[PDB]
Each structure stands twice: as C-alpha cells, then as structure tokens.
Amino acid sequence: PEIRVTPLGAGQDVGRSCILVSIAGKNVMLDCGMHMGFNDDRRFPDFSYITQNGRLTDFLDCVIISHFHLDHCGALPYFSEMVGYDGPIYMTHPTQAICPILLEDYRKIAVDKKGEANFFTSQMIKDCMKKVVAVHLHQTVQVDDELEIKAYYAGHVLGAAMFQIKVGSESVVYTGDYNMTPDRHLGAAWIDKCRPNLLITQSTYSKRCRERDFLKKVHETVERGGKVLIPVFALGRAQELCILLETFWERMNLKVPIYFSTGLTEKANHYYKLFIPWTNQKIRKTFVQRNMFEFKHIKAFDRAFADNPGPMVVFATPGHAGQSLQIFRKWAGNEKNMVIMPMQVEYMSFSAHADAKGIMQLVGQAEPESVLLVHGEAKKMEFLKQKIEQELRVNCYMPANGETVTLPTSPSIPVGISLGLLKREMAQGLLPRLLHGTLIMKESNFRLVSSEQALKELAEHQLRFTCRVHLHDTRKEQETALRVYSHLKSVLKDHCVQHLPDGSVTVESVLLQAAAPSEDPGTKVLLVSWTYQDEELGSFLTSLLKKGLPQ
Amino acid sequence: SLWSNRINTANSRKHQEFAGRLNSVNNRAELYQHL
Amino acid sequence: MKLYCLSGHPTLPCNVLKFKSTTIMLDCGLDMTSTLNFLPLPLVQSPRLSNLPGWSLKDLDKELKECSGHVFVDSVPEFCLPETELIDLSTVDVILISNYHCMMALPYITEHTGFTGTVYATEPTVQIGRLLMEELVNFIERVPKAQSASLWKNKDIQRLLPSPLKDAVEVSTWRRCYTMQEVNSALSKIQLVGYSQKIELFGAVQVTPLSSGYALGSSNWIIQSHYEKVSYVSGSSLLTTHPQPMDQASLKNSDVLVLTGLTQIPTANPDGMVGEFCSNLALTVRNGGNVLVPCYPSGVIYDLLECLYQYIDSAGLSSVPLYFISPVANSSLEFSQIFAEWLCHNKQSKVYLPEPPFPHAELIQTNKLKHYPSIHGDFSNDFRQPCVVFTGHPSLRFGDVVHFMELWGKSSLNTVIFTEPDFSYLEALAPYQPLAMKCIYCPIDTRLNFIQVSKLLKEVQPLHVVCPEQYTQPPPAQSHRMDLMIDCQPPAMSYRRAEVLALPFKRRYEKIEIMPELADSLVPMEIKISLATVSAVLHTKDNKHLLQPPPLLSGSIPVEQFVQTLEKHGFSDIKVEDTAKGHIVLLQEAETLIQIEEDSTHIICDNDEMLRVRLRDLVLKFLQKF
Ligand SMILES: [Zn+2]
Ligand SMILES: [Zn+2]
Predict the structure, then answer these.
(1) Measured at the alpha carbon of residue C479, what is the angle toward residues C476 and C482, in degrees to the nearest 5?
(2) Neighboring chain C residues of A97 at a CB cutoff of 8 Å
(3) CATH number of the domain that C285 lies in?
(4) Do A402 and B31 touch (CB under 8 A)?
(5) Domain ranges, residue C279
C-alpha cells in the first residue's frame, strides 16, 4: 500500500499549478495551471514528464479542474490538444461556461504579443471543450470501476469547487482556491467530516468595514458629481462590486447612472444570472421576487469617449493594451477627474482568497492525518506549516516543484459477517468477551463464517482437545466442587449468572464437571476441554491456584 | 501471511509509469531539461 | 424487510420501508381526486351555483347540492390524505422526495403527526413544490368557504348516496387545506441533495437519487446496504424530453424493486396527442374561438408551449396572444430557465453558448408571450377576446380556470382542452355539465408506459418487483387488453391501500472493516484454496463494525503417517492390535490411551511440560487453522 504524489509547479510558488497523483495506479490529473511572464514557453507543465511523446490517454484516465482562473486552467488547451489527449475530463458546468471565452481572450492577448508561434488555437479549444464532460455539485460520479469523483462547493468564484477523491478506504482531497469568508454574492466553502488521508490546500495568505468605506467614497464622488472608474480584470470581484453598488443605489433610491463597458462583462452577467444555485442565499431567495442581476444600472455605450463625465460608475477591463484604452485619454487631466484603482487613490481590492485562519478552520474541520501545501509564497507556507505543527502535532508536507511525496496507507480488508454471530456479539457487548474469527478465501473476495455455519461446507471433522488436570487431596469431591464454585464466583466478580443441572459451572466456553477416574481408585482425575484462547486463560488460572491457596 | 498475499494482489494491480519519477533522485524533478 | 403502503393511488405513492435499523418514508403523494366530489370555488360567486338545487335528506337540504343527476358537496374542497394512522409517523426518520407532485401533503405529515426526522429532495423539486403549494393555498384562500357539510361523511349517508360518492374510500380521513405558515414550517426541515449524491444515514444505510428523466428535478431513489440494495422507481421518461436523460445502469443488480408512477391511460401517444391538441387550437382560432388549457406550471406546460410555438410558427398563426395566468407564473418560467444543469444534453449544449436554454425568453423580450399573476393584476386591461389561456388547477374545483370556463361555458365557439392525465374529465365536467362548450380530452403522459417498464425490467432483471394491485389488473376501461399487463418471471406481488408487505429478501450478512495486523496474523496452508483463522475484539460506532486486536482446531491426522511418526520417535511399549469397534491401543509410556471410533474422537494429554511440548509440535506439523 503506497500513495504516490509529485506535484509540479506552484508547490513553493504561485501559478503553473499541476498536481499529478497515482493513488492506486490510477493517474488523476487534479489541475493544469500556468504563470504569465514565462516568455520562454515555461507557462505550461512538462508533458514529457509523463513520457516522451505518446498518448496521454494511455497514462491518464481522469482530469480535474478547480475553476476558470488561468492559474488553474490556463495550460489545458495545449496540453489536451497539441500533446494529444482525448480521455475523460471532469469539471463543473459553470466553469465550462466561463472558461472558453477567457481562454480565447487570453490567446488573443498572447497574439498581440506575437508569441503565438507555438500557442493555442480557437478551433482546438472548441474541439477539446466539446469533448469535456461536465459535473454537478456533489455529483458522486463513478469515473472508473473503483475510482469515484465527488465535488464540494468552494465559493472562491462562481463555479469553483473542491474535489473529494476516494478509492476503497483511500481518500484524497484537493481544493485549490477557496475561502471561509463568504462573498457578497457567493457562499462559503462547506464540506462534511470527510477525514481524508491527505489534503491539498493553498497557502497564499474588516471586509464589511472596507465595503462601507468603498461605498461611502463612491457615494461622496457621485454626490459631488465626480467621475471615477474601477479598472479591474477579475470577473468575480467585478460582479461582486456590481451587485454591491446596485443594491446600494437601490437602497438609497437615487437614480444616479452606473454602467459597464466590455461585452465580456455582459457575457459574464448572462452566465451569472443563468447559474443561480452557485451564489449566495439572498440571491436564491430574491430570485422568487424578481431577477437581481438585472437593473437600470445597465450597459455602456458612452458615445465612444464623447458622453462627458458626471456622477458615473464605470468598469473597464484592459489587458497590457486591451479594451477601450482611450478611456484614460477622455477622462483624467485634473484633480476632479479622479481615477481610482487598487484625485486620490485607495486599495479597494477585496481578498477573494481567505487568510491563514480560514485554512486553520478547514483543516480543523476535516482533520486529515496528512496535509499538503501548494500555491502560495514560500514564507507563508513555511509559517503556516510551523503553526500547524505547533497547534495540532499533525503531520504535514512542504513539497517543492517536482518534489516526490510518498505516504503510507492502511488498506482496510472488506469482508462479510454472519448475522447470528454479530447479533450474539452485540448482545454480549451490551451486557470483556472477545469474538473469534474464521474466514475462507473466496473468488476475488473474502468472507467470515461462524463455526456452526462453517460446518455447512460438507466434510467437517471436528477435533477437540481435552487436557487432564491432576490434584492430590484427601477431601471429598462434591464439597470441594462447591468450594471451588464459590471461590471462582467470588474471584470472577459475578460474571457467572448461569448454571448447569449436573452440578457443573461454566465460564465463557469451558466446562467444569466431576468425572470418576478410569480404573485407579487411589487417584482422582477430572477432564477439562477448551480451545487455545481458553487454554491460555485456564493455564494461567491453574498456575495462580497452584501458587497459593488456603490448603 | 494473508496480509502478505493481499498486498501482493494489490501490488499486482499495476499500470504504466512516468520516466521522471524513475529518474527522480532527491525527490525534486526537472522540468524542461533542454532549457 | 417490512414495507408499509399507505396510499392506494397508483401515481401518488405513500410507502414506508422498514430497512434494517432504519425506516424510510418513501413519498407523501396527496390524492387530489377527492376534491372532484365537492362544489367548485368560483373567484366571483356565480348566479348558477347560488340557484343550484339542493338534494333530499330524510334526517335539511342545504348540506348537499345536485347537478346533472350527480350530488356534489356544497362546502370547501377537502383532500384525501394517505392512511397515516397505520404506522406511527413519529418513528420514521427519513423522507425521500421523488418529484414535486409526490411531495404534496408533506405539511400534514411534518406538522400534524409530530414527525421530527429529516427530509431530502432535489432543488428544482423543492422550488416547484413551493410554487405549487403556495398557488393552491392561494386558490383556496382567495374566496374562503365554510366547512358547512360534515354529516354527509357518515357511512350510512354514503350508502344512501349514489355511486359517484359511494365509490369514495376513507372519506373520514379527508382534511381541509393547510396554510402557508404550515408550508413554511414544513419546508424548513428539508435538505437539498443533487443527482447521484450518496447520503449516509447513521453509518448504516446509503441512499442516492438518480435522474428519473420525467421532469426537471424529478429523481428515482435507491437504498443500499452493500450486501442488500433496494431500488425505488417513480415517474420516469425515456422520451426526448427536456430534463437530464433517464439513468438505467445504476438500477441493475437490485434485490427488491418498487414500481410506481406508470402512465394513466397508457394507450395514448403523447406526440400524437400534442399534434392533435395543436390542430384543435388551430381550428378554434380559425373559427375565432378561445382555448382554455388547465395545467400546472410544471414541465407539461413547458414542452406543450415549446411544441405550440413551433406549430404556430409553422402555420403562421402567431397573431393571437399567449396568456399564462398563475400566482407563480413568472417565478415558474424563470425557475425553469435558470435550472439548466438539470436539463438534457441539447439544453446543456445550448447554455454552453450565452443563450438561455428555453426560447420563450425571446418571446417575452419581444412581448410575444405574456403572463400575469392573476386576472385583476392588469390582465383585464391587456386582455383580448381571441386568445388561448393556460391557468388554474386541472381539477377545475378552484383556481382562475373556474371563472374562465364559467365565462366561456355558454358559447360553443370557444374550446376547452385537457392535458393532465390525473383526473377523469367526465367527473370534472359533471358540475358544469349543461353547456354547449366543446370539450376534448387529450391527456399527455410522458411517464413510462407498460411496454417501456417491461423492457426496463427485462434489461435489468431484478430479483423481485413491488407495485400497486392496479397495475397487476388490466384497466377497467378496457379489461381485455392483455398487452397492457406488467410481465415478470418472478411472481411480482402487489398490494392495496393500507396493506403491509414483507420483503422476500432475507440477506444475513453486512459489512465490517479489518486492519492489516489481523490480516497478517494468518499463516495459510495449501490443501488442494487458502484457509485462515483469527481472533479480534469487536468495536462499533455509528453502525460501523470494526475489528482490531486486543478459533477452532481441526487436526486431521492420517493413521498411517501417525503410526510411522510414532514408531520413528522411539517410544517404548508399542502395541498394535486389530479388534472390533475400531482400533484401540494401550500405551504405558505415560498412561496414555488413544481411541479411534466412527463419528467420535477423544484426545488425552498429560500436564507434563515435555510431553505437552512434544504433542504441540506433533500437532503443529499437521495443523490446519480452521
Ligand atoms: Zn485559484
Ligand atoms: Zn481562484
């Protein structure tokens, strides 16, 4: 029983997340990330690591994706198509909806850098994703004969989920980006007491007060009539800010305008309003009254940088030269024409990823025997590992990129038990006694069977040992037997509450009866029969009696 | 023993391997060796 | 091992399964057919009902009113609940909602009976069930009516009454409508679980719902105990329907199967019925009439309007407006739209693109489909005479359908259609019998018919099958069509209302876990097959039996090899003799005696340490650990 783990990328850093695991000889692909700035074609993992060339589907039979963020699914197109892969791929449906346009936009941005010589293509992305199989939340799909995949809600972004891998008694959980702290439009990650063998997590790192400050600043600007935009590329944070601003304006009842420019925002809004169940409970409940993603604070034409400023809230998504970059030229140029990004400027960015306290809460909840740390700063994961060691004394790991981690595991043996034996065992336990075990090797399985039930195999020739205990005393038999019975029932703490008609007392499964000798009248001998488990106890008790008695 | 035979059966359930784990010494693996 | 059946309805099951150390309530299944006897509840009190004559009573005619030779109860409609008094509902711990139709009457069980367990369902079923419950409560409470007739429920009066009321069963168990507060109380206890989600109950029973394919959210449940599996079948559809396609593989190797939700009037082909319904409304619009289609906000109206817009676009009759009136109409349409993951592969392909799944949103944006919460809510201003209306409850005893068909009852030009295969439309039209209105009964039933379920059983081959006795008999309408007869090589027993059934399965072995040290304790020896024996203490927590450390002996010794070994050992005073009653040898080395006799064996060993060691070694040379 061995567990093989060797993640590459993001083990001691951020980006290029790729965790390869072969839990029971079944290779599982948990993530395929990237990291921008690698102009030397280091963005993707090393496909040659599996084997120099060849069919990936031969080696891999399962692929998993966390969420639509490029650091979790950026290298999927080239890895799946260019290297050559047509095997099963499992990921959540909203991620399948959000992913393709993001990948295509990133591919176009790479084309703008003229580094598209050995890069993706739109057609192969469409072909690969059309072949990808979706998955629902908590869908315990059996992807193989022994391997199953179960997803759990993460809440980092819409469609983000964490996967529980189980085969036999083995258990592996990989989460990627999550957060205990709930978002303004998403729910917190939840999982039962899965208690898996291993856990893979991220180590990267006054929310309502920050929201109040942001809303107050925006309200002050619009009341003053100033125009301020929020250049942000993240879709989840943009949608959260849009929802927050929309509900804030609706609560204030004022009719100030607010719009969003890029059509990708409109596509994201369409996907968000389609996928209601992957959002906060207020969204789900308010859906009964009316759709909340739809509001008078709608889309932006802006007369193509000719509609003038005003009490306006606008969103732009450049990138780095994409989108309507002329917005800066039309605006700015004076203190009143403020432009705030993460006349003044403040950090309105919201930490989608949770802090170390969230990771502590998750590990305390699940309580795995081993943990694995990836996708974060080296200092952060070292400090978090030291804190885990200090607080819980639970084994952990700090694998570097490409570091091979092996974990021992205990494979429980599944067998069946006869109903009568279990009933007797439960009755004995309800009101010290230990249960025997007798099993027969079966065709691809093992079964336990009781001694009486085992006799049905007929043949069954039963042999029983009967040792003789010899004592030398002039006292009579029956009175000595009564004295022995009294002494035993006093020593055994009243564990004997049964009797036999022929003056015999039995404890557990040993019979004590008075029997005359064979031929010799001058010596008295009795016969006692027992099994080995009873034989050891009987020998110990006889030795204790022979050690000393009132004789 | 029964455990020994059972582990042999479990180990007998084997498939392909990766060249990089075979080549891995000190556990850490090399990616893009040409670079 | 024990299955309790409470509801006698075929398509509205209410069953309780006693399974090992747990008990499962299968479905609630409100029987709506009881309301058909009562007088309808008009939104605006019609003169006809006020001037409707009473009925004679020897013991006082205001209790009952009669129309068209059929006596109707002139009181608030009441619903036939399942026979819940058969089993103490407080005992049961789990409820497995299969579809939004079967979860009706859940407030009664959750509140009145004092049930304190848990309930499970799928999210679309919960939402659509909430919609249906609130809309029916709204229909009842819009025009409250007194419980002005109770003495009629006596068995003597029922015998004195004609057949349309005498056929009613357990009238005393009928109950008045619950309130929205009770609905809120009941839905608080429900837990949401998606398709193919294993749920463990007390570490003893695994329960999982699978996609039934009948309606979105509708699911078929399975119950597992590793060595025992019980599968429950509900309304399912193998047709090209909008929800996620029906799963068939997961139900295989099932010990006991429970069959429910077969089609009423199975002869009807739904596609031809939809086409004929389109033809009927087309000719009605051509003549200038109005079409009324009483139906739920469920999947039936959804695929009906799909085929309907397609048909009228083909025929170019899109001029007339579409009116869908219900208190939760807009909510139902939007809920149908958002639940795209639960739909079929075509819809999932469509929603991969930014477009929504269904196309009626395009009609709403272009204003070619219109809906309103009720009649008074600005629908009166926007109403136009030539149109088609979907509204009200299909029972015709309440909802806006009552007022609509009262308005259009006199004119023969207008038409009324029926599409819900859940009531006998002749009974429904009985309180409104004297009309020139043209009525067509063309139900659409997307569930599995008899041949489809027979094909399913032949493909799966379960050991046993359980279903209501209604399926076991041919329908009363035909009583001669032996093709519509569920066929099973096993007997496939059945039941009636309030009938207790004992499962034939009697598997007598459950699961247990073992840690590797006990496994290594064995030293198997070749015989022909491996043999082993161990001894461990039993530990169980949350119905999870475990074995961890804190056996009989079969020393089959051949006679000749034992004699050879004894001779080689060099012991003195060896005597061999052949006499009756087997071979008996007297050995004076240590006063030992060895006796061999058929069907018996006795072993004698002294307490001497050296002799004990030699005997143990001799046994160990030829010891089989079993
Ligand atoms: Zn992430
Ligand atoms: Zn993320």
Answers:
(1) 130
(2) 351-352
(3) 3.40.50.10890
(4) yes
(5) 270-441
